[PDB]
């Protein structure tokens, strides 16, 4: 059938749309109270201890680093995807812990202050070494450089609105521990206003429910890979001989990952008509893994209280 | 269709400094990539490279590496070359040629009519 | 790299005889993850600029009459025109692009006498 862009198209104002500009300041907003009100229930004492003896976050780092983007390759090989699809898939692979992880590992309660070492470290390697490594994963794939499309001022403004909270968080635990309850409450009520707004303007700014006509291939992949993360952490850290408090945490945040620098990396690379379902496919690769994170909190709050 | 239209002949000195244009108006610019062949009297084709209109990323080939530099405009829906460094060995054809490009450049569909360029005293 | 070499590079086809016509590339331009086989084969006409004939080594470019076939994988490809009609006379050059853009020598076609 020849070789030709997909008719997906974008309206011109997507770029630089009021609309979209509002969607980008409240989700910036929402994640700084995120990590304000998780960093509420955190202490320095614990973070030195953990980063102290490095054992989870190697394990995190391992686990995130060398084996995740081997079995993202072996899965783009294996299931015979396109060019533009295994260069996804990769750079979902390649990419750091999100801070979605940390919200996961809360309702799995588990050692706060490892996972947000782990997540910090692993974004800092990720800056590190994010080059390097999905260079010598895409031989055969993207033939330029690909080195200098990666963001690097996303991963440090991520990187500084993360720290901000939990700093804020850590020396108000430590300092003056009065004003938990005021501050928390009003944190509760507005994240879940703005996830109402978020959840509301992303309606229509999104539009377009054709992402069906992704390959069913390219979703079952995009289905194994969050599954074959938390497995992949939980089994790591299990046979690696951990306790079970420190283990949950340190699987939750391997499975879980940022796929917003994958969508800047595509976008910058094709343009909106070369790439197909593909531009829509890193949001459904997000909640197919809140899904899946949902369900493994079902079976953990199934097997506590048995 | 889709037709891309070269520049024109061009005779130029040894002191070099030409350039040419291909412009193609029958689709959506920045979808496809342009690439370059070179092509001397009965010596065969010669790929010499292309240019990404979309991010303005460009290839060459070892030998064209130095004389090569490909430029895209893409208000005015043209591909530039620039050789800036011109011997008598260099006269020969030069085609611009279209392909889609996912992540390997696929094949050349499209070709222009060619620009004999010419240098001498 | 890959440096592509046609065989025959000259012969003589008068009305209907084949041409099996090859070139054997330098090492295995076969995507294993996409069963694809990088190669067209264009056609040049002398005085014209060059025309797709075959993409992916199998497929022919709509447009040309049925006569090209293009049959091959791994290193070895083959084109045949069977039926040689009086307009098939010009230069094949069999490009490749699995990593490198690379033309082949070509092949000429004449007229026995």
């Known amino acids: 059938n020849a070789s030709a862009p997909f008719n997906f198209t974008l309206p011109p104002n997507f770029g630089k749309r009021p609309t979209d500009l509002a969607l980008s300041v409240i989700l910036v907003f929402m994640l700084f109270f995120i990590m304000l009100s998780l960093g509420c229930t955190m202490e320095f004492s614990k973070i030195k201890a953990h980063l102290w003896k490095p054992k989870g976050l190697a394990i995190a780092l391992v686990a995130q680093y060398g084996i995740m983007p081997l079995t993202a390759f072996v899965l783009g090989k294996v299931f015979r995807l396109k060019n533009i699809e295994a260069l996804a898939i990769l750079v979902c692979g390649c990419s750091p812990g999100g801070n979605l992880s940390n919200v996961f590992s809360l309702a799995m309660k588990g050692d706060m202050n490892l996972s947000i070492v782990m997540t910090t470290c692993s974004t800092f390697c990720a800056l590190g070494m994010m080059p390097l490594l999905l260079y010598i994963y895409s031989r055969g794939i993207y033939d330029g450089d690909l080195k200098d499309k990666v963001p690097y001022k996303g991963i440090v403004i991520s990187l500084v609105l993360v720290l901000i909270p939990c700093t804020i968080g850590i020396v108000l635990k430590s300092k003056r521990p009065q004003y938990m309850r005021y501050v928390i409450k009003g944190g509760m009520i507005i994240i879940l206003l703005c996830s109402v707004a978020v959840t509301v303007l992303s309606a229509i700014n999104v539009g377009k429910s054709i992402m069906f006509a992704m390959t069913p291939l390219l979703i079952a992949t995009s289905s194994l890979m969050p599954f074959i993360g938390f497995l992949l952490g939980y089994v790591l850290s299990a046979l690696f001989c951990l306790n079970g408090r420190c283990r949950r945490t340190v699987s939750m945040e391997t499975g879980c990952q940022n796929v917003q620098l994958c969508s800047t990396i595509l976008n910058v690379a094709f343009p909106p008509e070369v790439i197909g379902p593909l531009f829509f496919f890193p949001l459904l690769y997000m909640i197919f893994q809140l899904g899946e994170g949902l369900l493994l909190i079902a079976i953990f709050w199934c097997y506590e209280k048995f | 269709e889709v037709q891309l239209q070269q520049s024109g002949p061009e005779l130029v000195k040894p002191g070099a400094s030409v350039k040419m244009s291909c412009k193609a108006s029958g689709y959506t610019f920045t979808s496809y990539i342009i690439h370059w062949v070179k092509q001397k009297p009965g010596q065969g084709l010669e790929w010499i490279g292309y240019?990404?209109?979309?991010?303005?990323?460009?290839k060459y080939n070892e030998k064209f590496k130095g004389k090569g530099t490909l430029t895209s405009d893409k208000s005015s829906s043209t591909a530039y070359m620039e050789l800036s460094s011109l011997t008598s060995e260099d006269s020969a054809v030069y085609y611009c040629?279209?392909?889609?490009?996912?992540?390997?450049?696929?094949?050349?569909?499209?070709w222009g009519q060619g620009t004999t360029l010419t240098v001498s005293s | 790299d890959i440096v592509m070499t046609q065989s025959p590079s000259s012969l003589a086809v008068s009305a209907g005889e084949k041409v099996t016509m090859s070139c054997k590339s330098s090492q295995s331009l076969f995507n294993s993850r996409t069963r694809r086989n990088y190669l067209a084969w264009y056609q040049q006409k002398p005085g014209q600029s060059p025309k797709l004939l075959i993409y992916?080594?199998?497929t022919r470019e709509s447009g040309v009459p049925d006569r090209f076939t293009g049959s091959g994988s791994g290193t070895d490809f083959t084109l045949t025109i069977s039926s040689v009609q009086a307009e098939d006379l010009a230069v094949y050059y069999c490009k490749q692009s699995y990593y490198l853009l690379t033309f082949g020598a070509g092949t000429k076609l004449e007229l026995k006498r």
């Open positions: 240019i990404n209109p979309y991010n303005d990323g460009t």
């Open positions: 040629a279209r392909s889609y490009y996912d992540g390997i450049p696929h094949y050349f569909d499209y």
């Open positions: 992916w080594a199998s």
